[PDB]
Amino acid sequence: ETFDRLRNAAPAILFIDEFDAMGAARGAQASGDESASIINELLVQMDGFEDNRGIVVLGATNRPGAIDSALIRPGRFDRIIYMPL
Amino acid sequence: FISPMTPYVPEEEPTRTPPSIKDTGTLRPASEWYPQWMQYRRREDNYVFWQDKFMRCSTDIPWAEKRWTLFSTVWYLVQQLRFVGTPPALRYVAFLGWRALMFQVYAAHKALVLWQCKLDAGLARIGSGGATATFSKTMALRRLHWRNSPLAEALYALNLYKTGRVHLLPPVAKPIPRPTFFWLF
Amino acid sequence: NKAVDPNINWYEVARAMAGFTGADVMGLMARAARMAARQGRHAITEDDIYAAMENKTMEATLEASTAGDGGGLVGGEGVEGSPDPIPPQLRRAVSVYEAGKALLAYITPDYEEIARVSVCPLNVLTGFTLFVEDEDKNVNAILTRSELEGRMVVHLAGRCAEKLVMGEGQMTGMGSPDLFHANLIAREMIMSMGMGRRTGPI
Amino acid sequence: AKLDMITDLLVIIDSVRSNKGFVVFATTDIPHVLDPALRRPGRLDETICLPNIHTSNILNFTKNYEIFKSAKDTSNFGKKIILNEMQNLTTTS
Amino acid sequence: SNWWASINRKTGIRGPDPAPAEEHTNGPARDIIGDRMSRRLEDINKAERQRVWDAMRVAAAHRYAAGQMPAWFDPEWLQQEEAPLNAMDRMRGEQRRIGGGGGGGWWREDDPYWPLRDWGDHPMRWWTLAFAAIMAAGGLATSVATGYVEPVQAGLGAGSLLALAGAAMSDARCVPGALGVKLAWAVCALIVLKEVSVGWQHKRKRRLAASAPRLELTGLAAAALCAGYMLTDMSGLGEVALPPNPGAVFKSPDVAYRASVWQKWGYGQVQMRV
Amino acid sequence: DASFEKLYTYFDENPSFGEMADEAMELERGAEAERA
Amino acid sequence: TPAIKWDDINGIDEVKKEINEIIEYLRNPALLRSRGVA
Amino acid sequence: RYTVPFMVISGLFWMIHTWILDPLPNKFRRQEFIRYRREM
Amino acid sequence: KSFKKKYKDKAIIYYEVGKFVLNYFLNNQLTNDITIFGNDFLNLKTINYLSLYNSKNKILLQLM
Amino acid sequence: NYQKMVAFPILLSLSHLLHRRILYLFDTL
Amino acid sequence: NQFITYQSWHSHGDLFIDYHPPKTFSHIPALKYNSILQQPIGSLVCQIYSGLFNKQISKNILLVNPKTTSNNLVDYNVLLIQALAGETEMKIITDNAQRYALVNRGFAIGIKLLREVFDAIALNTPCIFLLEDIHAIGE
Amino acid sequence: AAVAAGWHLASFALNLAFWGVEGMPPDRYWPTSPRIRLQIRPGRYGNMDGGQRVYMDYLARSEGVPLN
Amino acid sequence: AAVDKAKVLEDVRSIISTQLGTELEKVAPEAKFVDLGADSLDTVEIMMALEEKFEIALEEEGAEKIATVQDAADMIAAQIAAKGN
Numbered sequence A: 001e002t003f004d005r006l007r008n009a010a011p012a013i014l015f016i017d018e019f020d021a022m023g024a025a026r027g028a029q030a031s032g033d034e035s036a037s038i039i040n041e042l043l044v045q046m047d048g049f050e051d052n053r054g055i056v057v058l059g060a061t062n063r064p065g066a067i068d069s070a071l072i073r074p075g076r077f078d079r080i081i082y083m084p085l
Numbered sequence B: 001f002i003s004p005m006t007p008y009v010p011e012e013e014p015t016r017t018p019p020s021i022k023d024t025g026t027l028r029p030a031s032e033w034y035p036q037w038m039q040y041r042r043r044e045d046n047y048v049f050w051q052d053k054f055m056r057c058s059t060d061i062p063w064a065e066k067r068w069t070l071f072s073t074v075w076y077l078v079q080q081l082r083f084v085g086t087p088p089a090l091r092y093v094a095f096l097g098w099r100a101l102m103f104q105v106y107a108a109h110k111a112l113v114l115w116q117c118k119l120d121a122g123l124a125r126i127g128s129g130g131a132t133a134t135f136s137k138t139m140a141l142r143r144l145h146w147r148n149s150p151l152a153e154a155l156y157a158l159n160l161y162k163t164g165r166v167h168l169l170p171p172v173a174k175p176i177p178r179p180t181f182f183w184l185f
Numbered sequence C: 001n002k003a004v005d006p007n008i009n010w011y012e013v014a015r016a017m018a019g020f021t022g023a024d025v026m027g028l029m030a031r032a033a034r035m036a037a038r039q040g041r042h043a044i045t046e047d048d049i050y051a052a053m054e055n056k057t058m059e060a061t062l063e064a065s066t067a068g069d070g071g072g073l074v075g076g077e078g079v080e081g082s083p084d085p086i087p088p089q090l091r092r093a094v095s096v097y098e099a100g101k102a103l104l105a106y107i108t109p110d111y112e113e114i115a116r117v118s119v120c121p122l123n124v125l126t127g128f129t130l131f132v133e134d135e136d137k138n139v140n141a142i143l144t145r146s147e148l149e150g151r152m153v154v155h156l157a158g159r160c161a162e163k164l165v166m167g168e169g170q171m172t173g174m175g176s177p178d179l180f181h182a183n184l185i186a187r188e189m190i191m192s193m194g195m196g197r198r199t200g201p202i
Numbered sequence D: 001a002k003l004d005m006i007t008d009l010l011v012i013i014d015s016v017r018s019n020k021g022f023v024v025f026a027t028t029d030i031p032h033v034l035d036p037a038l039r040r041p042g043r044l045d046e047t048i049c050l051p052n053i054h055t056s057n058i059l060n061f062t063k064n065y066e067i068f069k070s071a072k073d074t075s076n077f078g079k080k081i082i083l084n085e086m087q088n089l090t091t092t093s
Numbered sequence E: 001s002n003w004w005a006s007i008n009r010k011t012g013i014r015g016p017d018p019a020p021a022e023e024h025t026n027g028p029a030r031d032i033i034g035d036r037m038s039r040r041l042e043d044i045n046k047a048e049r050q051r052v053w054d055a056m057r058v059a060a061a062h063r064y065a066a067g068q069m070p071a072w073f074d075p076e077w078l079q080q081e082e083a084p085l086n087a088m089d090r091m092r093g094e095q096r097r098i099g100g101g102g103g104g105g106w107w108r109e110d111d112p113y114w115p116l117r118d119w120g121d122h123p124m125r126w127w128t129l130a131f132a133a134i135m136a137a138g139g140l141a142t143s144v145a146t147g148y149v150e151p152v153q154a155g156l157g158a159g160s161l162l163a164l165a166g167a168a169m170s171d172a173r174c175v176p177g178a179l180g181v182k183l184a185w186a187v188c189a190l191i192v193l194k195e196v197s198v199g200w201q202h203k204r205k206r207r208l209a210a211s212a213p214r215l216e217l218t219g220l221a222a223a224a225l226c227a228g229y230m231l232t233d234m235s236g237l238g239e240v241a242l243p244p245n246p247g248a249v250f251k252s253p254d255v256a257y258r259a260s261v262w263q264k265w266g267y268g269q270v271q272m273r274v
Numbered sequence F: 001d002a003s004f005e006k007l008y009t010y011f012d013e014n015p016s017f018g019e020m021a022d023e024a025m026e027l028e029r030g031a032e033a034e035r036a
Numbered sequence G: 001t002p003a004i005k006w007d008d009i010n011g012i013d014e015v016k017k018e019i020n021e022i023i024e025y026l027r028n029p030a031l032l033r034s035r036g037v038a
Numbered sequence H: 001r002y003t004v005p006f007m008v009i010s011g012l013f014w015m016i017h018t019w020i021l022d023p024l025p026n027k028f029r030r031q032e033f034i035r036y037r038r039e040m
Numbered sequence I: 001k002s003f004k005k006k007y008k009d010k011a012i013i014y015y016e017v018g019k020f021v022l023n024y025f026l027n028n029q030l031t032n033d034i035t036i037f038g039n040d041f042l043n044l045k046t047i048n049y050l051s052l053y054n055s056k057n058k059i060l061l062q063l064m
Numbered sequence J: 001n002y003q004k005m006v007a008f009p010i011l012l013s014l015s016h017l018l019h020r021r022i023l024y025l026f027d028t029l
Numbered sequence K: 001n002q003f004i005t006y007q008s009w010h011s012h013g014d015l016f017i018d019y020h021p022p023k024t025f026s027h028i029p030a031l032k033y034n035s036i037l038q039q040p041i042g043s044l045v046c047q048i049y050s051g052l053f054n055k056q057i058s059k060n061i062l063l064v065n066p067k068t069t070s071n072n073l074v075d076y077n078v079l080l081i082q083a084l085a086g087e088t089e090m091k092i093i094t095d096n097a098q099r100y101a102l103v104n105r106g107f108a109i110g111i112k113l114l115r116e117v118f119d120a121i122a123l124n125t126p127c128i129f130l131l132e133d134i135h136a137i138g139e
Numbered sequence L: 001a002a003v004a005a006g007w008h009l010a011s012f013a014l015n016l017a018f019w020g021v022e023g024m025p026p027d028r029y030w031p032t033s034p035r036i037r038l039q040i041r042p043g044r045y046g047n048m049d050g051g052q053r054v055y056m057d058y059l060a061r062s063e064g065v066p067l068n
Numbered sequence M: 001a002a003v004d005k006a007k008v009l010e011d012v013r014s015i016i017s018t019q020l021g022t023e024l025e026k027v028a029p030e031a032k033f034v035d036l037g038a039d040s041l042d043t044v045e046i047m048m049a050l051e052e053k054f055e056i057a058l059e060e061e062g063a064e065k066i067a068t069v070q071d072a073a074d075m076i077a078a079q080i081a082a083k084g085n
């Protein structure tokens, strides 16, 4: 529903904070149907088919190496910006 | 200014794909799959049999063969009807018939080349008296491999008929480049 | 089931395949069909099967001598440490090396007999002699001093031959694994098997 | 770390031969740590080694050059016509 | 003969044969990468240098015709066809290694295959000039003899175009040569088309079966000239074709080129996802 | 007498970038005109 | 949907161009594709 | 006149000819197993 | 102030000039028609090839 | 001339377009 | 754009079948200079274009690209397989074997997941499986 | 009538010589699924949990197994 | 390209013998075709048969200088080596 609303109001800059809540993989959390379903839906909504014209998703994270090999694959979140001091 | 002896011969881009590594060049049908000389070569140096398929059909396509024109637009329909519009069974039986016919026409061309060798000897006698009565085996293979233009054939025959000189050959004919007329073909 | 040449002595081939399971045999026939395609044939011959065994050995060595940088051993690549037309001096040295190894394995009595000898298999800058063992002769447990000393002679044979032919200064580094193997046999005879006269059984 | 997954990966890879229609490509950068059982026939036995590409002249200039030249015609023969319009003693042609 | 028993490990081990051969270097880099890739790299460098030189002289031509050139520029340098570096490399290679048309004519004494020598012109130059002459003469004679004006209008009018094409084909290594052979083919194809579709007005007869546009000697000669152009040389100006489709650039590695074709073909705003 | 190194240095200082780069520069100029 | 300017940011210098890429992608595509960003 | 019955005959024959003759590339058993194990 | 700049610049340009002079002389002034400017940075694969094969002269060429 | 010469490319194009139009009629249905 | 990334044939894991990637062998000029690649890649392409790859016996092929690339700046194994699938216009299903490196409470959940994936890809034929980093589970 | 029926039989025999899929390349313009060809995806309205059960039963019947 | 010259010579001898009438023995490497009594046109027919058997293009310039069976096999083997390129 978030991505459908975004595709309605579609030039847009959806900013997601604490991406490690959903951008991580199995580990110290109970990785069952829940995280798999939300990451599958994030993958298909970011990927294609539903054309995301004018939609940029800025994901804030502190551990990019903790981001799964599903949202790094060329065509998901390939661009990465490091904020220096 | 920087004239390097030989007058600079501009090397244009190729317009036709180079002939396949399994070709014979002699109007004879090529082999079914394997060109039969690989058995006389070492293994793992026969890698250039698929390296002919690549760069003959994938990676070294001449850009003159990628030209979009009205003739190529029409010809796509013929090729589409041949490949996806005609069953491979009927294509196979037509392929067998064409192979047999091409073998027969190659035998006919080989006999014609041997007769042209006999005519070569006859014209080389009438023109040098009776001394030179041989014939050029390199020119025989040149006729067999279709490397001669009709002008070259006529000039060589005339040359035999009035001065002899069997082993003085015309230049080898260059490959015919692909004709292009703007957007037409 | 498949297409093979009928003039194949499957016993001699199975003798060359001493120490194999059955799925190993199956996969070896599959890659023998691959070598038949490489040579340009649809049918499999015993030459194709022997080339499959050589290809397996060379592939096994190549996936231990390229894992990160490699060098020299895989010639014919078109990249940095691998000239594509293996130079005449290098192929002469490889031929001399493998001819010396084959000759000194032939003239050594009671040795493993030669099935094939190949110069630069898989465009690899060394030769390869396919040696067939007699499992029924000395099972998988028996080594005698005659066999060990003959193996030492045969493994030093290639570098001795290339030293005699190409000269002392033109010897290449392809004799290093065989030299280390001869040194390994001598080290196991002296320090492990207790065949030293002065060292003794310790 | 319980490494019993190897003896099930062997069965999983061996079950592909009973199947038909698809092709599996298993990629790795370290074949030495691979299980030798996994290299047995009926399993990932056929190997296509792809050597390194970071070759300063060869597989950099040739690579980038064919990649650039395969994207467009880059033929400018007709643009040489101005080389035949240089000695007109006029203002334009 | 007992060349062993003197083999010394201290004074050096030598065989009976006095050394194998010599060692050929041809450069450290060519030792490193080998042939078939040194050759490929050399051909790539030569082709790229020639392309850069041709682009440089075309751009220098455009700037010199604009009067935007510095005072040291010599327009005669634009007559240097080969790249200077390739010309120098060819000088190095050659210094380290060593019936009356077109040109002359010898006729069964010496140089017998003189017509096949590259004289600088197209092979069909004298054929198209002769066809222009006979077309103009036949059209004038037919119009004088009958009174129809289609023979002279479709006579001299096409003969002038064929003569201009034959003039342009006198140097068949340039854009005028390619344009001349294309113009000559267009004129001969138009003659064949008119002859086999419409016919000749002065050849109109009473019966419908006697009208019969057909293909007479003029159409046969024009079709033979067309086939002569196709079978001798027509390649050149092959850059002029229909504009590339979005289906060409679907697998193109150039995002900029794919987007340019996308925008030119009206799509433009379709997501690329590459 | 080389006298073409002048041409090479001149065309390295003032090169021509092709029709595609001309189109890209036209797009950039239109963007700066519509933005600034 | 929530409700100091860009020039008020001074802690970054080089990555401002990479962020400017996002600004120009949202304000003007097919210019970003002319810079190779599909 | 003969179009409709021949079209019906060909339609029935090609309905049979992708269910029995020329099905999926001998992977029907794997598909049915997937259906057995996925109804949990 | 600028003499140190002159010394440093002269050292850098003479290093580069001598390196490319040696590269041209070895790779070109010694089929084999187009001028090739071979490149340095031998890797471990190249080092292994030149050490296990070739000769003392061919190693000395790389050292030059 | 032109009798079965201006017809064969046109009939070829008509056959190809007709087949693609039947496929696209299935697609729109 | 005929390049699409639909879900599996079963659909409603998420196998993520990739249809017609926009790649060709012109993307790899390093393929024409490799003697090892020509025979298997050309055999696969000609089997696909002939249709025989539909009815052929499935096979596993190991690919080796040694670890010299800085970070993940375009892996040449996935580049080559994507070029194969794009040239042949064929479904390609990619996966990483790291995601199946799971052992919990003495049981391997990643093994069951990989078995489910290998049994699910059996239904979307013809296709090209691309299992990357087989060393992660095949140690 | 024999000529008309022979024309129809010739068309049917041509289709028989076509037979299956062999000899035909895969086409990026014509995938085997109309949902691939068009852009048809299920969304928020319509999909419900029980629909998985119904989908399972329809897929079992379409594959040809009498289990549910 | 590492052509098996022994195999090439054996098949060349077989072709020469097969065309003419002699056995495989009489066709020796050093034997001249003239010795076998193949006429000029017959030598040409033998070159054609060699081309047909090896599926290669014989090097025209130099076919007037094919004298020995060894020369024929050497030119053929050089062509087999040069075919792959």
Ligand SMILES: CCCCCCCCCCCCCCCCCC(=O)OC[C@H](CO[C@@H]1O[C@H](CO[C@H]2O[C@H](CO)[C@H](O)[C@H](O)[C@H]2O)[C@H](O)[C@H](O)[C@H]1O)OC(=O)CCCCCCCCCCCCCCCCC
Pocket: B082, B086, B090, B091, B093, B094, B095, B096, B097, B098, B099, B101
């Ligand atoms: C043991 C089995 C018994 C039968 C087998 C043999 C007996 C009869 C064989 C067929 C009939 C006679 C064929 C003679 C001429 C070939 C016809 C043709 O035009 O040429 C056919 C060509 C040749 O095939 C392809 O041809 C390609 C193109 O080459 C040639 O392609 C053309 C050949 O026409 C041009 O001439 C061109 O110049 C030349 O380059 C390739 O080179 C290959 O050869 C191959 O791929 O095919 C094409 O392009 C066109 C594809 C469709 C045309 C179908 C024509 C005939 C179909 C018969 C079906 C009836 C079924 C009952 C069985 C009984 C058979 C009567």
